[PDB]
Amino acid sequence: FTEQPIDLVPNQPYPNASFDNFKFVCDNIKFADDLNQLTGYKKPASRELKVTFFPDLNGDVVAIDYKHYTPSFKKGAKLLHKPIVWHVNNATNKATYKPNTWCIRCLWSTKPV
């Protein structure tokens, strides 16, 4: 056994969405800056969303391997409530781009606006 991400469900950004000026932070700073490149984060960040790689879910965002992507996750996904982002070999490529743009808008704090 190697723990597969089993509790993946579709997620979707909310209509009337607002981009919170938040930043990604992660020990793989190359992965965080590639994700921050898709958000528009300007210094200083209002908050930091620590990104951890699955199965490590101690960060506010879990990074799932793109091998587990299904068309059901086209607008985003969440692994039991910690919003997710896709990665191939712990990095962003041209396959993860389009699904990750949706995953980033799922993080938009139009909730507490």
Question: Which technique?
Answer: X-ray
Distance separating alpha carbons of residues 42 and 23, to the nearest angstrom: 8
Q: Which residues pair with 75 in a beta bridge?
A: none
Residues with Cβ within 8 Å of 60's Cβ and at least 6 positions away in sequence, in order, are: 49, 50, 51, 82, 83
Domain that holds residue 101: 1-113
Q: What is the resolution of the experimental data for this entry, in Å?
A: 2.5
Query: CA 37 → CA 26, 48, 100, distances in Å?
Result: 14, 15, 11
Number of Cβ atoms within 10 Å of the Cβ of 16: 6
Beta strands 61-65; 82-87: pairing state = parallel
Q: Which helix (DSSP H) or strand (DSSP E) does residue 89 occupy?
A: none
SS (H, E, C) 43-75: CCCCCEEEEEECCCCCCCEEEEEHHHCCHHHCC
Number of domains in the chain: 1
CB 109 within 8 A of CB 18: yes
Distance separating alpha carbons of residues 59 and 75, to the nearest angstrom: 21
